Amino acid sequence: TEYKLVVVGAGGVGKSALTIQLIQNHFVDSYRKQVVIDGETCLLDILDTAEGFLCVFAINNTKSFEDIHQYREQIKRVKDSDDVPMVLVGNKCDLAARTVESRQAQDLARSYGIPYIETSAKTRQGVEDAFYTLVREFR
Numbered sequence: 001t002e003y004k005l006v007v008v009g010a011g012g013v014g015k016s017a018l019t020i021q022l023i024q025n026h027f028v029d030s031y032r033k034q035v036v037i038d039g040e041t042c043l044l045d046i047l048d049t050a051e052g053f054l055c056v057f058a059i060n061n062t063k064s065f066e067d068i069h070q071y072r073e074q075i076k077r078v079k080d081s082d083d084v085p086m087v088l089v090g091n092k093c094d095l096a097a098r099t100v101e102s103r104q105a106q107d108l109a110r111s112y113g114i115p116y117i118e119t120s121a122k123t124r125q126g127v128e129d130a131f132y133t134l135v136r137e138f139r
């Protein structure tokens with residue numbers, strides 16, 4: 001179950017930090033892990049890049065947010081669908097240096113028909129929520 005939770009974003013947004021937090025539960029390749037989400041026991045196979053896509057930007061990195069659009073166009077163009085499980089993640093919410101406003105990310109996730117989750121991989125704030133939210137978009 002559950003290919004491939006491909007985690008994709010601009011360098012240094014926190015794709016590695018988020019994933020290892022999920023798998024290895026510590027703040028610092030592919031991973032497979034049996035999880036329970038809303039009662040179901042399923043397998044996450046997670047591709048941390050260097051079926052479902054976790055699209056990550058950093059809330060202090062404006063370029064990494066504007067890159068979101070290219071990732072989306074490349075996803076619609078490869079799955080031939082405007083409904084492929086995908087979640088927009090605003091990482092690094094623990095920082096005060098926010099150049100990307102919550103509303104912007106949300107208005108973008110809106111026009112895509114996809115959820116938006118603000119996260120911190122440093123604190124584990126909202127990490128399960130982001131991945132588990134990606135799985136719920138399959139259902």
Ligand SMILES: Nc1nc2c(ncn2[C@@H]2O[C@H](COP(=O)(O)OP(=O)(O)O)[C@@H](O)[C@H]2O)c(=O)[nH]1
Nearest residue numbers: 011012013014015016017028091092120121122
């Ligand atoms: N303050 C803060 N720093 C972070 C967060 N996520 C990642 N980092 C830092 O950003 C650096 C690079 O992030 P990384 O996990 O390598 O993202 P990746 O290169 O896209 O895989 C790491 O040294 C982390 O310590 C976060 O949520 N908050």
